[PDB]
């Protein structure tokens, strides 16, 4: 649960929003994610109806020991031109530095954006803290069908919902634009 | 084909509940505006006997 | 009578309309959540 | 006195093991109050500064 | 300090107060005594171009060195000095410079870190152990570095 | 001033609320009709 608040300081300014995500063991057992501390995560999003590539950002992940239990992460969400797309895959790539391991875990924004919906001079000292309380909201992955949790931390904010820009006609069917 | 018959079967059900949760979260974000607008008039009504006094 | 009649009119007519806007938010939170368990 | 001196130590030895004096500022009972310890190692100045910071992490 | 603020008031005179400048710089207080120095500085035009060319590489250089060194095996005192860094320094986008540009803003930066640190830790000093204030004769022993 | 101030208050505050009730009817007529063509 420290792995959320570390990423708000260092992954935070390089993004638009962070999707704070906690993956239970039921999600871990399907994708076979062996929780060693050597694993270096990396995230990038694959756009739709636009030139699809964003920059790769290294995201910290720490195992939570026990009210859920599992791997804690933080997924970057990218708002190109002021709004989110509904059909936009946020890809997580899991790999070890020394040994041979490469996993791809993919998340869609509608399973993330919906889940977000409810004299000597003094120097400023801002440590990393877990003081902020979590709100645990359910989610299900579209691609495997394994449940994962989404943290919504307390901080033109309460007035608006989180923006989306749905696709327009003509369009392929959304089971064929997801895959 | 029969794997596409199950992708198009399940992702028409997973994506359907995401749009219905989005639809409620549009609606509750606007009823909050109406309760912020009804209570703004009623607050001005509580001083309407004072605003007419000038 | 401008104080007394406008207090009983411009509040109680507003409170009966404000409680009916919340019925729209509570009906969808009952029925759209009913659609998923019954039909989806 | 053996109370002040904190001894640090296959390691080679020269014709030398130095003795350092560290004077550490802190604050006890929300009032300023320093502290002084003595060290003893023949590890070279790049290592001892890394070894003193381990002693004063708390 | 005097050589830096006398270059801002040459470019823009409305930013430096001359009366505030020579009240805090020309007085030196040491050993309970005040020494009024004599200033009319082409000697210090090597430091002020090295200390200010280091002044902009440090806010990028301490964020770029923290985003790479994040892991389970982090040294525990760096969690404490993770808060002394200001708010505005932790909003730098490191993507706006290219990867061949971020190499030459470290190798340039690390040379102005060491070569500026070395000239103040130079040791042609000598330890006086006797001094007579009216004869001015002092005994000592030399000690290099 | 009871005629002039209550005319500009108790109409324009009501018209801005009345136009927002119709936004709820137009949003469902746009989105529930969107669900059928996209997903059903």
Swiss-Prot record, chains C, F:
Record's subcellular location: Virion tegument; Host cytoplasm; Host nucleus
Family note: Belongs to the herpesviridae large tegument protein family.
Free-text function comment from the UniProt entry: Large tegument protein that plays multiple roles in the viral cycle. During viral entry, remains associated with the capsid while most of the tegument is detached and participates in the capsid transport toward the host nucleus. Plays a role in the routing of the capsid at the nuclear pore complex and subsequent uncoating. Within the host nucleus, acts as a deneddylase and promotes the degradation of nuclear CRLs (cullin-RING ubiquitin ligases) and thereby stabilizes nuclear CRL substrates, while cytoplasmic CRLs remain unaffected.
Complex and partners: Interacts with host CUL1 and CUL4A; these interactions inhibit the E3 ligase activity of cullins. Interacts with inner tegument protein. Interacts with capsid vertex specific component CVC2. Interacts with the major capsid protein/MCP.
Protein name as it appears in the record: Large tegument protein deneddylase
Top-rank taxon: Viruses
Full-protein residues shown: 2596 to 2635 of 2635
